[PDB]
Every structure is written in structure tokens, then in C-alpha cells.
Design an enzyme around this catalytic site. Sequence first.
Site, PDB file in Angstrom:
ATOM      1  N   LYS B 187      -3.119   3.766  -0.668  1.00 30.95           N
ATOM      2  CA  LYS B 187      -4.320   4.593  -0.562  1.00 30.95           C
ATOM      3  C   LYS B 187      -5.207   4.476  -1.797  1.00 30.95           C
ATOM      4  O   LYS B 187      -6.418   4.699  -1.706  1.00 30.95           O
ATOM      5  CB  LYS B 187      -3.941   6.055  -0.326  1.00 30.95           C
ATOM      6  CG  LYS B 187      -3.392   6.345   1.064  1.00 30.95           C
ATOM      7  CD  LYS B 187      -4.498   6.345   2.108  1.00 30.95           C
ATOM      8  CE  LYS B 187      -4.023   6.915   3.431  1.00 30.95           C
ATOM      9  NZ  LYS B 187      -5.100   6.881   4.456  1.00 30.95           N
ATOM     10  N   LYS B 188      -4.633   4.133  -2.946  1.00 34.81           N
ATOM     11  CA  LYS B 188      -5.392   3.943  -4.175  1.00 34.81           C
ATOM     12  C   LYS B 188      -5.960   2.536  -4.317  1.00 34.81           C
ATOM     13  O   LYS B 188      -6.555   2.233  -5.358  1.00 34.81           O
ATOM     14  CB  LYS B 188      -4.514   4.287  -5.380  1.00 34.81           C
ATOM     15  CG  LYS B 188      -4.233   5.774  -5.503  1.00 34.81           C
ATOM     16  CD  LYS B 188      -3.621   6.129  -6.842  1.00 34.81           C
ATOM     17  CE  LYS B 188      -3.425   7.628  -6.981  1.00 34.81           C
ATOM     18  NZ  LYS B 188      -2.597   8.198  -5.889  1.00 34.81           N
ATOM     19  N   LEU B 189      -5.801   1.676  -3.311  1.00 31.86           N
ATOM     20  CA  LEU B 189      -6.495   0.387  -3.269  1.00 31.86           C
ATOM     21  C   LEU B 189      -7.902   0.576  -2.698  1.00 31.86           C
ATOM     22  O   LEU B 189      -8.272   0.031  -1.658  1.00 31.86           O
ATOM     23  CB  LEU B 189      -5.695  -0.621  -2.447  1.00 31.86           C
ATOM     24  CG  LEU B 189      -4.459  -1.289  -3.059  1.00 31.86           C
ATOM     25  CD1 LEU B 189      -3.866  -2.263  -2.061  1.00 31.86           C
ATOM     26  CD2 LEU B 189      -4.789  -2.020  -4.349  1.00 31.86           C
TER      27      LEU B 189
END
Lengths: 53, 698
Positions: B187-189
Site C-alpha cells: 500500500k505504501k508503493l
Amino acid sequence: SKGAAFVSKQEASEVLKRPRRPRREVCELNPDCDELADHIGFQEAYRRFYGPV
Amino acid sequence: DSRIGKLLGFEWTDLSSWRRLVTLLNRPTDPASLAVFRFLFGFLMVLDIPQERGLSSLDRKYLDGLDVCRFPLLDALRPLPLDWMYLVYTIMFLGALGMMLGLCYRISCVLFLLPYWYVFLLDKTSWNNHSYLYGLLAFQLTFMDANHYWSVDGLLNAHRRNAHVPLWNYAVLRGQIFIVYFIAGVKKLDADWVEGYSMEYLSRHWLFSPFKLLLSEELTSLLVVHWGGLLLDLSAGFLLFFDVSRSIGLFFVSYFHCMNSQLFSIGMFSYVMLASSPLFCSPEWPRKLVSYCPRRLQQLLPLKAAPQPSVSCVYKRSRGKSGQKPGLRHQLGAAFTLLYLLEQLFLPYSHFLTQGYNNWTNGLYGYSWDMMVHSRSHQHVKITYRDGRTGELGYLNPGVFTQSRRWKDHADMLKQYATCLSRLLPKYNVTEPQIYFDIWVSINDRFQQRIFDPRVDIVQAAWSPFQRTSWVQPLLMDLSPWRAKLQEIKSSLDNHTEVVFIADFPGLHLENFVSEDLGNTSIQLLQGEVTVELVAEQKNQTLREGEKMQLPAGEYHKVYTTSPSPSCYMYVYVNTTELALEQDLAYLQELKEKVENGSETGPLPPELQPLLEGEVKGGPEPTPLVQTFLRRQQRLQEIERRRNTPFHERFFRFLLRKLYVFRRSFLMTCISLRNLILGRPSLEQLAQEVTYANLRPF
Ligand SMILES: C/C(=C\Cc1c(C)c(O)c2ccccc2c1O)CCC[C@H](C)CCC[C@H](C)CCCC(C)C
Ligand SMILES: *[C@@H]1O[C@H](CO)[C@@H](O[C@@H]2O[C@H](CO)[C@@H](O)[C@H](O)[C@H]2NC(C)=O)[C@H](O)[C@H]1NC(C)=O
Ligand SMILES: *[C@@H]1O[C@H](CO)[C@@H](O[C@@H]2O[C@H](CO)[C@@H](O)[C@H](O)[C@H]2NC(C)=O)[C@H](O)[C@H]1NC(C)=O
Ligand SMILES: *[C@@H]1O[C@H](CO)[C@@H](O)[C@H](O)[C@H]1NC(C)=O
Ligand SMILES: *[C@@H]1O[C@H](CO)[C@@H](O)[C@H](O)[C@H]1NC(C)=O
């Protein structure tokens, strides 16, 4: 102007207002806050339920 | 014997058939690590109930007779009266204690689970990832045989004292932690995380001081804060499983969680993750730790002998006997493990079905594991209402009849707020109204822009969970690169001037009222075509690119967008009254310094005498300037005294405050339990008890 719920046209339309006295409010963190006592009608309800504190 | 079997702990042939899979997922395993995690989780939840769940503050959130707009997931759900809510929290506390001590484990788990989800689903504004995780962990531990070691229930029942447990108890927990780490990592990509925008200002914390010895702040905020978090999420997902990388993984994960605990105010989540990290170790670490102690400690610590056979595991019989045929609980356990892990994988990416909840972000916050990825800054909120009888137009206080401020970002919460206002306004002499909202918000330092259409009556608007909302404005991602240039404009200003950047759709217009204090206000156009209208003389001028106008102070003005594309402009303003007050205060301070250092031999003015005396006694009341000067001086002295405080005093105040919270929670719960059981006494007694409960410990 009939109570605390309503505001005048001038105060409603000021976009350029000082927010604090720094926002950047991120989610997660911790929801709880002490501002709950600023609700409308808190003093009367609290007096009815817990008496003349 | 095979390397794959050693690394993964199972052979390929174990997966050839369903029966072998059930036998693999119900093999015997030592219970010790599961028991340790149960104890730690119970203790942390016990500490967490009076602090974050809101038991101390529950007297001022569900007060009877107060008119509040709730935000439950289902409109059918409504709060109970306050006393029954305190009973519910009491049941929660008893369930948490039972889980911690392992006394009546299944009943305690149920008593913790059902109330927790009742409270969780009741309000969507209190949702967050670390409450969802606690709910899921409580759900999982309801079925696991975690009371087989170091539990009171073992002492009361010989069959459940130091007994084997099936493997899937460990497998589900390890899978849950791995899913948390991996889903958070992926999700942090995002473009806003890999580029340094989200959490841009956290690198200034003193904990990052050593990194600044070798790196600059701009790199320290990118390589360490942002990329480090992503790499640690993925690696801590993968490293802890394998034996080779477990030590480094534990070290990095512990450092990560300690820093997250210190930087943020998330609560018990860091400690819960720290308690969950050891489960990837061997299942028998507490037993060998107990073995490596003197005999005196062994007389008090749990048993060290090998665990006894159990009935909830499939035992391979090497006596020549036919292998034990798996029953029903083993197949149910295997199916539960597989289906639960599949559901946990699927649910974060289930946003294409519930499109009603979709927004600039995806879905409601809490079950996506997207932590500290989006930061929002709201500028203005205007709520207008038109009466359905007379036709009068009026404006509401933006935060009226509400306790949170997350309704500015979700269409469903906006609809619930609109319905609540529709039902409540008839008490205030307003007939069937039509309510309009105008909200400005910027995510990750973009142009501030509308989020909902300001021309749509939200009371009569159309909303359903599984269809896209037609009155949510799109987020303009085409204006993202401007975040470079705007930052330069942010650095070109004086210490007094301030700037606000606005982007608007075509057709819409913004009406604004510049207050009398904000003199010397200007508007500049950055992109598009706009027309600025002054209503004092009804004069409208069309502004092209790179043109500046000096707006009136104390009058109304309007900006209309008249281009095919959205138009971006900027308000640059300075507060004149504050500047004049600061100059006068500086002059007064300068005169005071001249008086103190011996200069200005002439007699002081009478208005200056209170400054030297410092107290208004036996004289005329001070002027506002003198009052402001004294207040500023007192505030500065108070701040300076606060800074010069030794550590032990701060620790003592922290402990006293926490003790106050716990005592208040316990006393209020006892009062209400008495009210429920023995009835409600007179008002004077209630007031006296409530006064006693609120008393500071000292
Ligand atoms: C605030 C951060 C991530 C959000 C977050 C939080 C708060 C969690 O509670 C999580 C719990 C479990 C899984 C994911 C979580 C999560 O995503 C980055 C914090 C970064 C930290 C301050 C950087 C220092 C540590 C790095 C990894 C050191 C690396 C050193 C390099 C030289 C290799
Ligand atoms: C009015 O505010 C403007 C900004 O809105 C300020 O203008 C600055 O004036 C000084 C004059 O020496 C220039 O050096 C700066 O570059 C100007 N700032 C800009 C263009 O952003 C100023 O504070 C106020 N000006 C007046 C005349 O009151
Ligand atoms: C100044 O120009 C603006 C630019 O449109 C005018 O706005 C229009 O006003 C008329 C009524 O005067 C409305 O019917 C239009 O819908 C408005 N346009 C838009 C795009 O909303 C404004 O009226 C003009 N003011 C004066 C005094 O002439
Ligand atoms: C208008 O509201 C006020 C304030 O709540 C109330 O006293 C009064 O009953 C209302 N007046 C009329 C004429 O309905
Ligand atoms: C401007 O400065 C004055 C100084 O007294 C302050 O009261 C006010 O809140 C500031 N903001 C506005 C919008 O006037």
C-alpha cells in the site's frame, strides 16, 4: 442568529481565517479528545443526569 | 531431510491429498509461545480499555438527553443509555482479565469479542487500523487452545494442563502478522510515499539526530523515513520466517516499533506488535528460558516438563496401529484457517464492490493497512440551509451537533449528518430545509479544492452503498507537479505575509469576505481564466495569466471561473492589526528597557507605571495594550519555566495523570452499577459522588 447553531453571513464566508491560535491532521493517531464538553446543551444535560455538580 | 522440508517445515507430499493437509495442519505443537502471547495481549487490552476505548470519557459522549448526530455503519444500531454502556465496558474488562489469566477462556473471549465489535461498529469516526487488528486478534483467539499452558484453567482441569495444540493456531497468527506487514508495504508503493510528500516533516524529531551526522535533512527525510519504512515492511514480512534472518529481523522490527511508539501517539499498537514478533521463533522458547534458571525460580515459574498428549491433534501412530482418522474439529480448523487467510488477503482490495464508500481515497479508513500515507488540511467549511416555508437563507455553525470531524471527507457520513440536521432543525423554528455543503480540502500539500458539489441538496441527494456517488468532485492529479513551484513561492515570503492556493472548477464561483483586519490583500492568477467581481460597485474584471489585483478589505468579493479547464490562483495577504500591535508592543518594550538600564531619566508616563509595578492595585484599569504586554510576558515566562523542568518531575506528573484516569473510570463504573442494581438515589447524593469521583489524586 437564533442560538449557537446558526451564524451570520459574514462569519460563514471568511475563507481566509486563522485555523490555529498546525493542522496537518493525519489519520490513525488516537481519536479521543477533551473537546466533547463544548457540545450544545452539555451543561443542562449533565445537570439533569448527574445533578448540580 | 529435504532442504525445502527443513526451510518450510513441511514436505510437498503432505499437500497431495486433503487428509494429509488436515494432518499437517493439526500436527502436535508446543503451547508455550501461544500462552505468552495470550497473556501479553490480555494485559495490553486491560491497560487499553480505560485509555483509548474511552471509558474515562464515556460520561461525556453518550450522555442522556443530549442531541447528537451519530455515525453508525448500520442506521438500525443506536446507543443504549449510559448505565448500560458502562455495564458493557465492565463486561469487556472482565473478558480481558479472563483472557489474560486464562480463566474460562472461551467464555472470556466471547465476552470480550461481542461488546468490542458492538462498540466498534457503533461509530465510524473512531475507526483505525490498530482497533481493527485488536478485533481480529480477539476473533482468532476465541477458537485457539491458548489456555493449555500457564493458565488457571489448567490448574482447575488436569486434561488442559501443559498439553499439545494443533499447528494451525500458530499458522493463523503468523499469517495475520505477515499479511499486515506485506499489505502495509505494498500500500505504501504510492507516488506520494516514494517521493517524500507524506510524512515530510517527521525528520525534524530529535530521534533522527544521529542520521543527520552523515546525511542532510532532505535526504534523511527520504532515504530513512520513507524508503526505510517500505523496506522494513516487506523484509519484516519475510525475514522473521526463516531461521537465518530471524535475529536481524527481530532487531530491525524492535527498533522500528520503539521509534513508532515514541514519534506517534498510536497507543498500544507498537507494544502489541512487539509482543507478536516472538511468535515466529520456535514454539518452545519460554520452556527453555524457564529451564535456564536456578531452582528457586523454577519453583514459581510454569512447568518445564514435556507436554502431555491432547485430543485436539492428529497423532501419527508408529506402533503398527492404523493412523488416527481425522474427525470433525480438525477439518473445521483447516477450513477455517484457509478461508480466513483468503478473506484477509481479499478484504483490503475489495473496494471495487463497495463503491459508495469510495472517495479521493479508497473506502472507509481502518481495514486497508494504509497507515500514514495521506495527510489532509482543511481550509473552510460552509453549511447553508434554505427554509422550506419562508424561503430564508441562513448559515450554520460548521461543527454543530457533532463530536468528530471526519464527516468532511466521506459522502456517507455527510448524508447521515444532513439527515440528522433535517430532523433536528425543526426544534429551531426551521421548516423542512434544503441543506448545502461547501468544503475545501487538500491532500499531501496540493491546491485546496472542493470535495463535494456545492449546488446539490444533500438531504434529497441519492446514495447507495454499491453505486458511485454522483456529487463527489474528482481529485485533479494533473496539477500535482505544481507542488514543486508552489513550495518556492512559499519560501519567497516575509515573516508576516501568508499565502493560500486555490483551484476551482469551471462554472462554479467562490464568494469571500475579507475581514477588516486583513488589509493589503492581493489575488494573483497562476493558470486558467477567472473574473473577479466587487459587489460594492458591481464591477467585474477578467484576469489573464500573471496578473495581480489589490482586493478591498472589509467587503465582499467573488471569483468566477470562465475557462474550459479548472483555474488555479492564490491569495496573498498580511494581517495589518497584528503588525501594528507588534510595533506598539516593541516600542513599549524598548521604553521599558531604556527605563531599566538608566536611560530616559525623565518621569515615566502614568500608563507605564503598571508595567514597572506589574500589578493593577489602587489605580486606573490598564489600557488594552498594557494588558496584552503583561499577558505576553507572563506567557513567555510560563513557557520558559515549562522548558526548564527536570525529567523526574515530568515522569511523576505522567504517572499521576494516568492514575487519575484509572481512578475516575473505576469510580464512575461503580456509581452506575449501583444505579442499575439498587436504583437511582436523590440528586444531592449523585452530585456528591460525582464530585468525589472527579477529585485529583494529589
Ligand atoms: C510511520 C511509518 C510507517 C507507518 C507504520 C506504523 C506507524 C506501524 O506501527 C506499522 C506497524 C507494522 C507494520 C507497518 C507499520 C507502518 O507502516 C514509518 C516509520 C519509519 C522509521 C521511523 C524509520 C527507522 C527504521 C528504518 C527501517 C531503519 C532502516 C535503516 C537503513 C539503513 C536500512
Ligand atoms: C502588501 O503585501 C505585499 C504582498 O501581498 C507585500 O509586498 C512586498 O513589498 C516589499 C516592498 O519592499 C517587496 O520587497 C516584496 O517583494 C513584496 N512582496 C511580494 C511581491 O510578495 C507588502 O508587505 C505589502 N505592501 C504594502 C505596500 O503594504
Ligand atoms: C461580472 O461578470 C461575471 C462573469 O460571469 C458575471 O457572472 C454572471 O452573472 C449573471 C448575472 O449577472 C449570471 O446569470 C451568470 O450565470 C454569471 N456567470 C456565471 C459563469 O456564473 C457577473 O454577473 C458580472 N457582474 C456584473 C455586475 O455585471
Ligand atoms: C423560536 O425558537 C425559540 C428559541 O428556541 C423559542 O423560544 C420559540 O418557541 C420559537 N418561536 C416561535 C414563534 O415559534
Ligand atoms: C488578524 O490579526 C488580529 C490581531 O489582533 C487577530 O485578532 C485576528 O484573528 C487575525 N485574523 C483575522 C482574520 O483578522
